[PDB]
Design a protein around this ligand. Sequence first.
Ligand code: A1BT4
Ligand code: A1BT4
Lengths: 265, 265
Amino acid sequence: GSLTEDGLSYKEKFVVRSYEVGSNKTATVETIANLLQEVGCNHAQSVGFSTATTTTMRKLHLIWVTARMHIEIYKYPAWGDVVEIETWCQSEGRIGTRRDWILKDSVTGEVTGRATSKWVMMNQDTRRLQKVSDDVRDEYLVFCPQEPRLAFPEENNRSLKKIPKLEDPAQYSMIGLKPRRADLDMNQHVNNVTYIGWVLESIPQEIVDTHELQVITLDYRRECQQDDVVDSLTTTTSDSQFLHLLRLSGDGQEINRGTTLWRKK
Amino acid sequence: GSLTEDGLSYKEKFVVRSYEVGSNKTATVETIANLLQEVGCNHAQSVGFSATTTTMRKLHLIWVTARMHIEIYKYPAWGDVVEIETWCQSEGRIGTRRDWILKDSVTGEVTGRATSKWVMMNQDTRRLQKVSDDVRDEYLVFCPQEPRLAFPEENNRSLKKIPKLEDPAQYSMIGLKPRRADLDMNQHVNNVTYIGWVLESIPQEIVDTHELQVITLDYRRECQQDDVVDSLTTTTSNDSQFLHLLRLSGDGQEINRGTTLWRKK
Ligand SMILES: O=c1ccc(OC(F)F)c[nH]1
Ligand SMILES: O=c1ccc(OC(F)F)c[nH]1
């Protein structure tokens, strides 16, 4: 992959692997979510970040953490196909950061999906959220479009809707979910993609067999740690819509909420 | 990737991805095992398969893994290119072998090797059988005719008999369940998942302070989507050796056994 001409966005091509696809021989949403995160990392390497901590962030032990992940897929790429992913970052002034992605058929050049994500600043030791400094903004505005560039430009759009809290009892549930070493990143934290899978695990197999996932919106409230256990809850709200809750098996502490939308095949 | 000049082997290059690495910023043995399966699949595609031959599709026959053997000298680093070569060979009427060599792309030196034994099984009845001449002949056109062994040595750890762990196990991980990211395109648990499940009963202190050199895994029965696995480990030993058993948490039915060898970092 490479920075584009203006050095304000990054593109990479990926061949869809045998193990990356589900029962219709197209990419899972989790494969897709892993590819967004790889091209996010490849963009940060290309422009000097880490080896996405800036020099000021390293000083005060500050990190970016995902608050929100929104993905819309029109077509899942097939086993053996090339997908082109472009990604850029923007400042939401002092609130935090946004990363946006556009997914294209390499062969046709047509948009096959789009994703947006909200990142906020956290201490790392104390895990306390805060506003972005100001000294920090200047150091990464050099790497972002100055004019707004939005994967989801439409005024009132799915990617910005408030998500309510599922009320007990849930229509469906998958209890006793536990991460393994394959679910951890290189800093030994549970990978953000794992949560996407744990949310999807309470959807009935019959919906998955007969529908395609078109939109997922997931809020991240709190981390699941190595020795935690998650319950996954789902109620139909409706094309079919679901409301989703991830919480710890014990004390029922919320880790995530979300919604998904599925089309009939 | 592509077939070599003689068309009796297949080569492919892989860039190691952000999410594919552990705490050393090098590839996990599960990332390695996934890459081996992708190059195995790309070789079968290249020589005209879809990995069943005409006669097997007629008789509803498939290859299934009886054994995986993997030895790693160096785990490739995040961003590095690993080159993997692969070929099959007939083992008479017993089954087939698939063998792999991993190289540093930049240096050309061998950094891993792996060998696997596959047997013929009825898709439906799940009954093992010997390989028939009509089938042996259909796939010898793709295999080197002289022997080519990744593990040639006369007394080599890839062929040793593996004993059954005796209760009580020294270590255990209880209540392991596949999620949908553990399934392949045919909705069977991925052979790499059992590797991860075997590794989950190794204490974190061994993993933090040692590197996996060798893994040998036997495949007895598969885990269904709605089964639950227990993972057991006893130390059997400068080098730490362990003995492994995966079994179904209910009735204690054996799904896998194996051994691992680790060196101090
Ligand atoms: O561990 C955390 C804490 C917070 C968060 O999101 C923030 F917006 F609330 C994500 N992950
Ligand atoms: O379901 C099966 C059938 C066979 C097998 O391998 C064979 F060696 F036992 C593994 N898993």
